Design an enzyme around this catalytic site. Sequence first.
Site, PDB file in Angstrom:
ATOM      1  N   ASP A  25      51.916 -11.619  81.646  1.00 43.32           N
ATOM      2  CA  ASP A  25      51.360 -11.565  82.995  1.00 43.32           C
ATOM      3  C   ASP A  25      52.043 -10.553  83.906  1.00 43.32           C
ATOM      4  OD1 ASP A  25      50.315 -12.054  85.504  1.00 43.32           O
ATOM      5  OD2 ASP A  25      50.534 -14.247  85.358  1.00 43.32           O
ATOM      6  N   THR A  26      51.459  -9.356  84.007  1.00 47.48           N
ATOM      7  CA  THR A  26      52.120  -8.295  84.770  1.00 47.48           C
ATOM      8  C   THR A  26      52.063  -8.581  86.256  1.00 47.48           C
ATOM      9  OG1 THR A  26      50.085  -6.940  84.698  1.00 47.48           O
ATOM     10  CG2 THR A  26      51.737  -6.558  83.023  1.00 47.48           C
ATOM     11  N   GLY A  27      51.274  -9.566  86.665  1.00 44.34           N
ATOM     12  CA  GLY A  27      51.125  -9.885  88.060  1.00 44.34           C
ATOM     13  C   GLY A  27      52.098 -10.935  88.557  1.00 44.34           C
TER      14      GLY A  27
END
EC number: 3.4.23.16
Lengths: 99, 99
Positions: A25-27
């Site tokens: 999850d890059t967010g």
Amino acid sequence: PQITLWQRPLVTIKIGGQLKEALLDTGADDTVLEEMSLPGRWKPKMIGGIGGFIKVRQYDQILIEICGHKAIGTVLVGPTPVNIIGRNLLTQIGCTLNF
Amino acid sequence: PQITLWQRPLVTIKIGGQLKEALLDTGADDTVLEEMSLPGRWKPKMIGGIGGFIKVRQYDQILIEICGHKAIGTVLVGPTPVNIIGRNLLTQIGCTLNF
């Protein structure tokens, strides 16, 4: 690996002697896992995002093997909808975004 | 570009004739933007994640230029903490994860 995003980027992880699935999850700044048994000291913590906030338990120096890559770091434990691997651990396994 | 994750993966986008910053978010199925003015028909919608749910407005066939790459698709509008570009649009600009 290289991972396209037509499906959720779900990987297997090993943490606290247990096998789980988690979302790359890059967010997410931080790594957040559904309730689970982890050894040791923790600190109560509140994290927010869309929708409101949750109370988490913050465990530090936790070893996690993500898709076969080892990392050590902070892991939050609580009522997340899904297990999330956030940037604090993605950096350790050399994950980048490319387009 | 190639984007490492020591910082949030924030890109400039152009949508509805306006310039904004948004987070490339592999953990998001959908694209969710803070309140903003968008032309046209929309549908009321409720989305959840950690913390609870929000009411959104769902606008379809919206053109968005993400870091210079054009895409068209669905965009949710509502009380998100940050503008998020989700997998529905990341696939269109050829974004992958690599480690």
